[PDB]
Ligand SMILES: [Fe+2]
């Protein structure tokens with residue numbers, strides 16, 4: 001009946017998995033088949049994609065410092081996750097997590113998405129700030145459902161082309 005096992009020390013765990021909180025893996029999911037998706041995310045890792053989560057995301061930056069490039073009231077704001085910070089992101093707020101420090105570790109909690117509720121991933125033009133490409137996905141496994149999504153964007157000039165100013169988006173690296 002204790003489906004997810006008994007209580008364990010969190011720092012030690014983080015230490016035991018330090019080799020997975022670094023590229024290319026970069027994050028690790030604490031429990032499997034749970035309704036709460038509990039993830040530790042490591043560094044370093046930058047990315048150009050923005051996430052459109054239809055549910056809330058909870059952050060607690062345990063070690064080191066990160067930041068979330070945001071889109072808030074139509075402007076490109078930025079949330080700082082200094083060490084020891086917690087943050088609660090409301091549904092659908094577009095966010096792009098940047099984690100430059102090696103050895104950093106941030107607790108990110110989310111919930112499973114019920115059938116029909118779709119996550120969006122989308123990129124924006126560094127020139128005019130328009131929307132360049134959005135992909136909606138039914139998230140089940142974050143490792144089998146998500147790398148291919150980005151890889152197909154990187155590998156297509158068409159998808160990356162701003163439909164407004166014509167500028168082609170850089171792709172993997174800003
Ligand atoms: Fe997210």
Ligand SMILES: [Fe+2]
Nearest residue numbers: 125128162165
């Ligand atoms: Fe553009």
